[PDB]
Amino acid sequence: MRKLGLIAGGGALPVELASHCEAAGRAFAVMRLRSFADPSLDRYPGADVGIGEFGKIFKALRAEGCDVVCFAGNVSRPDFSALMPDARGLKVLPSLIVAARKGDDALLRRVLDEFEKEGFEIEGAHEVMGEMTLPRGRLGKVSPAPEHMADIDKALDVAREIGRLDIGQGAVVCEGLVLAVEAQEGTDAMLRRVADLPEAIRGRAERRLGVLAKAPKPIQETRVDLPTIGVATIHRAARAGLAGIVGEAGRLLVVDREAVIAAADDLGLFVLGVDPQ
């Protein structure tokens, strides 16, 4: 996982991105564009730079060891007279004004040419999310078996009806039997209480049965964060003799992706991203 240089313009997108990055445990820093970046970003490591202190931005970008950057947020073309660039900066400035004369698009494009020529890999907001969340389909080497399809389907739309009822975000289904429903206790606790059920209605570590599904509750006016998967999640779900874990393909954060994949792989669990709706 490349460390991210989040270049933050105005609005709520970079803010969401930062939080999700920190939840996923992904490494980053924030380049907060003066007068654009929302102040609730000052809490993250990084730097407050004006446009176009390009010299400064490359400086801090390398200073944080970012090799990939994402540009997220509202930015409008500036005043080119009132601009107070550093000397890098002033070097780039005319190239900008030419492109600017051709339109915002050519201008934005020109800015990116510079970061590429400098040179950092450029990523879009969607791809940043994509790489931290579930994929579509298996995450590790283990796939589900036809036996598990049954539970996978009902694990989810149960876990969704829980969410619709503003309760918890998780549910464990084994052979059609809802064994466990999350609400307020955390997923670890639930997976423990499941390991504790009679092996009769349960899966076995030898022969595994049953599926953990964890799905996000529907959006709100209040900001909404995504459900998460830990390495300890893989641990306890294995100890419950569960066959695998599942969630909506974009809508679930994986904390330490590498580590999670290795637990699931070593223990025989599948982890599955599922097409939303």
How far apart are alpha carbons 49 and 139 in whole angstroms? 38
For residue 81, the minimal CB distance to ligand LP5 (Å) is 12
Burial letters for 86-118: b for 16+ Cβ neighbours within 10 Å, e otherwise? bebbeebeeebeebbeeeeeebeebbeebbeee
- Return the one option of a second copy, ligand LP5, Mg ion, none that residue 277 interacts with (CB less than 5 to 8 A, by type): none
Give the residue, chosen from 124, 186, 218, 276, that forms a contact with Mg ion under the rule CB under 5 A.
124
Whether 156 contacts 246, CB under 8 Å: yes
First to last CA, the chain: 29
The count of residues interacting with ligand LP5 (CB under 6 A) is 19
For residue 186, state whether it binds Mg ion (rule: CB under 5 A): no
For residue 111, the minimal CB distance to ligand LP5 (Å) is 5
Give the residue, chosen from 72, 142, 174, 253, that forms a contact with ligand LP5 under the rule CB under 6 A.
72
- Return the one option of a second copy, Mg ion, ligand LP5, none that residue 185 interacts with (CB less than 5 to 8 A, by type): a second copy
Question: What are the structure tokens assigned to 118, written together?
Answer: 């400098």
Q: What is the DSSP string of 136-159?
A: SEESSSPPPPHHHHHHHHHHHHHH
Q: What is the 3-state secondary structure (H, E, C) of 57-107?
A: HHHHHHHCCCCEEEEECECCCCCCCCCCCCCCCCCCHHHHHHHHCCCHHHH
CA 59 to chain centre: 26
Amino acid at 151: D
Please say which residue, 81 or 184, places its beta carbon nearer to a second copy: 184
Please say which residue, 12 or 189, places its beta carbon nearer to Mg ion: 12
Near ligand LP5 in 37-56, by CB under 6 A: 49, 51-54
- Return the one option of ligand LP5, a second copy, Mg ion, none that residue 1 interacts with (CB less than 5 to 8 A, by type): none
For residue 248, the minimal CB distance to ligand LP5 (Å) is 22
Question: What are the structure tokens assigned to 121, written together?
Answer: 């890999």
Please say which residue, 12 or 189, places its beta carbon nearer to a second copy: 189
Residues 6 or more apart whose Cβ sits within 8 Å of residue 111:
96
Give the residue, chosen from 23, 27, 90, 107, that forms a contact with ligand LP5 under the rule CB under 6 A.
107
For residue 62, state whether it binds ligand LP5 (rule: CB under 6 A): no
| Interacting residues toward a second copy by CB under 8 A | 158, 161-162, 165-168, 177-181, 183-185, 189, 193, 196-197, 201
For residue 260, state whether it binds ligand LP5 (rule: CB under 6 A): no
Whether 234 contacts 267, CB under 8 Å: yes
Give how far Cα 170 sits from Cα of 30, 152, 157, Å: 32, 13, 10
For residue 71, state whether it binds ligand LP5 (rule: CB under 6 A): yes
Residues 6 or more apart whose Cβ sits within 8 Å of residue 162:
168, 169, 170, 171, 181, 182, 183
For residue 116, the minimal CB distance to Mg ion (Å) is 12
For residue 101, the minimal CB distance to ligand LP5 (Å) is 13
For residue 178, the minimal CB distance to ligand LP5 (Å) is 36
Residues that bind ligand LP5 (CB under 6 A): 9, 49, 51-54, 57, 71-73, 75-78, 96, 104, 107-108, 111
